[PDB]
Amino acid sequence: DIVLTQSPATLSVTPGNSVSLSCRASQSIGNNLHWYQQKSHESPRLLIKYASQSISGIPSRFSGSGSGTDFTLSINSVETEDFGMYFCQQSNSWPYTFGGGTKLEIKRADAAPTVSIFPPSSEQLTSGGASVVCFLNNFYPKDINVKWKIDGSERQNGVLNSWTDQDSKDSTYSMSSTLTLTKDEYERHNSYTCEATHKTSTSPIVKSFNRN
């Protein structure tokens, strides 16, 4: 099958600046290359067809060029609304194939996470379990680490982490981390701490609570 290789994997762009995205085909595909945008929680949207043909209703700041094996999508004057995934697709040969996608990230000022910790609810304890939850919210850039401690010692088991996509309104990222214990184990310890390590400081942000 025709393999489409997109580059780079990720672009970080300040709104107002321009950028371009590459798609390379493993064989020549003429002009038979189509570009899609896919925003978070939406379906793909066609931006350019047949390498360079414009699409009704798509802003003129999107353009496409190239032929044969090498194709370029250009976005002049990037706007915050342009964040998401970009994919190329070839229609030269069956089966149709897609590139692996380029993520467009909006650049903004660094921001430290807002960290909040929550103990297990009365309701969960009654069923025999105990989850401690830590939200690390509205930070930038995206990379972050959470470490949990129980009575000051690092705890690595029972942790489940989840991360949002870039926020459409402020361009930040968030993360949730949940430490789940048995009620019996929870009631054997006194302090529960989550620590966020982020680019914004050499010292992690620490939040704790003390059992009941």
Partner 1 sequence: KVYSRCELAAAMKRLGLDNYRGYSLGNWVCAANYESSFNTQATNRNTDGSTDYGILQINSRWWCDDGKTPGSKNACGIPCSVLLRSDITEAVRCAKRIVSDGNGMNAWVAWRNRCRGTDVSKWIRGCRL
Partner 2 sequence: DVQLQESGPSLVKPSQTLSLTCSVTGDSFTSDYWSWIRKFPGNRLEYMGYVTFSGSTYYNPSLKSRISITRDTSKNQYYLDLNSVTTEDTATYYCANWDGDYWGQGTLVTVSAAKTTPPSVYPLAPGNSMVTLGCLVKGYFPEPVTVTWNSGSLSSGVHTFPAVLQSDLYTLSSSVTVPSSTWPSETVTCNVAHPASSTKVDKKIVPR
Binding site for partner 1 (CB under 8 A): 28-32, 50-51, 67, 91-94
Chain centroid to CA 208: 27
Q: Counting contacts by CB under 8 A, is residue 64 touching partner 2? A: no
- Residue 168: Cβ-neighbour burial (10 angstroms; 0-12, 13-18, 19+): middle
Q: Counting contacts by CB under 8 A, is residue 11 touching partner 2? A: no
* Residue 1 C-beta: closest distance to partner 1, Å: 14
Measured CA to CA, the distance from residue 65 to residue 26 in angstroms comes to: 17
Q: Quick one: 31 or 114, whose CB is closer to partner 1?
A: 31
Q: Counting contacts by CB under 8 A, is residue 145 touching partner 2? A: no
Q: Counting contacts by CB under 8 A, is residue 54 touching partner 2? A: no
Q: Which of 103, 74, 89 is nearest to 25 (CA)?
A: 89
Q: 3-state DSSP call for residue 86?
A: strand
* Residue 47 C-beta: closest distance to partner 1, Å: 17
Determine the interface stretch with partner 2 among 20-28, 66-74, 91-99, 105-113 (rule: CB under 8 A): 91-99
Residue 46 tokens read as 């066609």
